[PDB]
Write a protein that binds this ligand. Structure first.
Ligand SMILES: CC(C)N(CCCNC(=O)Nc1ccc(C(C)(C)C)cc1)C[C@H]1O[C@@H](n2cc(Br)c3c(N)ncnc32)[C@H](O)[C@@H]1O
Ligand SMILES: [Br-]
Ligand code: NA
Length: 335
């Protein structure tokens, strides 16, 4: 029983792949995962990138065991020489840093490869195109929504957990949670979780704390939890009006400066407060459309945008102050 092995850049147990190399889905197989892993490790380590004939990496026979073993051996010899080099005066690769965005894309693709066996049991973008689509949206969102160790992040309806893992690897939040109700994605999420931790260690990279849970985010337990969350991500684009209504109710108890990022806005972008809409959620949040994923369209055929809501109760304060003022009250009461 033949196999291929890649040594970890930081001395974790090596990655082992049986020959013939597994096919993961229609566009992902182990051969190209191995090639990409080497390519990414080379990005981590200048010296490795120096030893490898980089353009030759594409001119390997992925169907030949000898050709692929030649590639792995070459990589492994070079890793050994790098570990020796670190024992000398040369300072080793800094440990427990966060992965670059490019590396993180590869790691999550790799985790998804080893975890999700049936993509068809899953339902703007599907999890199989995550790397080329949602990942970029999430990365853009991470860059725009600055988060600190005072934040708690929750992904409402977290599926197989991709968003949670991406955000946990990339930010400083105290904790990251994902909640998923359906058993198929929740089950896969357990594997996604184990694989992520394994692969993150394999590359020597750090992530913040996270928990992927089974549960219903509309439950009474989640009522209090949503209220104590400072950053919510929710892909609500296809949610019904009753679900969206229930979420608005839950968001209404969030603290000032709390933020919600969604694929469908929970309030109008140009909400203007008056006597008929006083109890509506637009009274207590700013809503802006964030920059789209340039050069990518949804299954709807349209560029995918995302909406940021910020809890801000001064909107309501200003409305009430104005009502006290007879000048402004007349100026408002002109319909
Ligand atoms: C459709 C979505 C809600 N989910 C996508 C899964 C992967 N997560 C994800 O994609 N998150 C995310 C993506 C992008 C963004 C931005 C930044 C681009 C806005 C933010 C978050 C679908 C999942 O939601 C679950 N779901 C549906 C309801 Br209804 C529900 C519920 N009540 N409780 C728990 N889970 C629930 C279902 O079981 C299902 O698995
Ligand atoms: Br529901
Ligand atoms: Na080189």
């Amino acid at each position: 029983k033949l196999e291929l092995r890649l040594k970890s850049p930081v001395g974790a147990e090596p990655a082992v792949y049986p020959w013939p190399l597994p096919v993961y889905d229609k566009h992902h197989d182990a051969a190209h995962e191995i090639i990409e892993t080497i390519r990414w490790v080379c990005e981590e380590i200048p010296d490795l990138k120096l030893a490898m004939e980089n353009y030759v990496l594409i001119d390997y026979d992925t169907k030949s065991f000898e050709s692929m073993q030649r590639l792995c051996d070459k990589y492994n010899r070079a890793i050994d020489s790098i570990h020796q080099l670190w024992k000398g005066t040369t300072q080793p690769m800094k440990l427990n840093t966060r992965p670059s965005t490019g590396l993180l894309r590869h790691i999550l693709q790799q985790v998804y490869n080893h975890s999700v066996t049936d993509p068809e049991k899953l339902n703007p973008f599907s999890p199989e195109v995550y790397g080329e689509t949602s990942f970029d949206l999430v990365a853009q969102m991470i860059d725009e929504i600055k988060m600190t160790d005072d934040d708690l992040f929750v992904d409402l309806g977290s599926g197989v957990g991709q968003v949670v893992l991406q955000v946990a690897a990339a930010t400083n939040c105290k904790h990251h949670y994902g909640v998923e109700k359906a058993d198929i994605p929740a089950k896969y999420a357990e594997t996604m979780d184990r694989e992520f931790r394994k692969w993150m260690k394999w590359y020597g990279k750090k992530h913040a704390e996270y928990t992927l849970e089974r549960g219903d985010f509309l439950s009474e337990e989640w009522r209090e939890r949503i209220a104590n969350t400072s950053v919510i991500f929710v892909n609500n684009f296809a949610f019904g009006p009753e679900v969206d209504h229930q979420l608005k109710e839950r968001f209404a108890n969030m603290k000032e400066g709390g933020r919600i990022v969604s694929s469908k806005p929970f309030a109008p972008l140009n909400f203007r407060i008056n006597s008929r809409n006083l109890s509506d959620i637009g009274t207590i949040m700013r809503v802006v459309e964030l920059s789209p994923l340039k050069g990518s369209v949804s299954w709807t055929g349209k560029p995918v945008s995302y909406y940021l809501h910020t809890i801000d109760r001064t909107i309501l304060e200003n409305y009430f102050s104005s009502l006290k003022n007879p000048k402004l009250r007349e100026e408002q009461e002109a319909a």
